Design a protein around this nucleic acid. Sequence first.
RNA 1: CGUCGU
Length: 215
Amino acid sequence: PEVFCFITKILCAHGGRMTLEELLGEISLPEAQLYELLKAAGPDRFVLLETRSVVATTRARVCRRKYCQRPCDSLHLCKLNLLGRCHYAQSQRNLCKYSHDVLSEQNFQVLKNHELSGLNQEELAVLLVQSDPFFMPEICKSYKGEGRKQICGQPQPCERLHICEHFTRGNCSYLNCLRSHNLMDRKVLAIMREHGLSSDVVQNIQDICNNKHTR
RNA sequence: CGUCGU
Ligand SMILES: [Zn+2]
Ligand SMILES: [Zn+2]
Ligand SMILES: [Zn+2]
Ligand SMILES: [Zn+2]
């Protein structure tokens, strides 16, 4: 029960993804023990890839509401502050309607349910930016397929993601979806990078979503 | 002027 957090912390320390070989070069287990532990926690915690790689993930999500009334089993926090980027950490302190206490008692309890309470703020941020689609740039609501040319402000090119929103939440079931499931697209990667997500992070998001899509 | 906003 405590071994899973141990692994996650190391994965989160190394960008959220490590090869199985490189993982073994950090721990005191033979490959047989490690590999059977990853399978146990399941793909909602560790996504396994083909050399072999492991991608860290979690079901834990940040509440999307501006103001939320309990009950709610999501984390409640300022994403910006978690990333250390909220400009209202010092000067106003108010005018940010979101919690700057990452490890609040309500949050600590959510973290417990997802077996993440041993994580520091940096690891938690690493895990969430690649697991919680709420940390992604806005997805274009008018986008309808790459065989169209819809009004995303033609004279001012769309600054939003043109991908399938259902895919990002692991819920695309459309037989022959027309919306892109390809996050590694050049223009997507640019918006992603502008938003603070490197191509390495997007690749992890891509692989987590792919795993969820191949249900 | 689309959520988290010098
Ligand atoms: Zn909530
Ligand atoms: Zn804030
Ligand atoms: Zn668009
Ligand atoms: Zn889709």
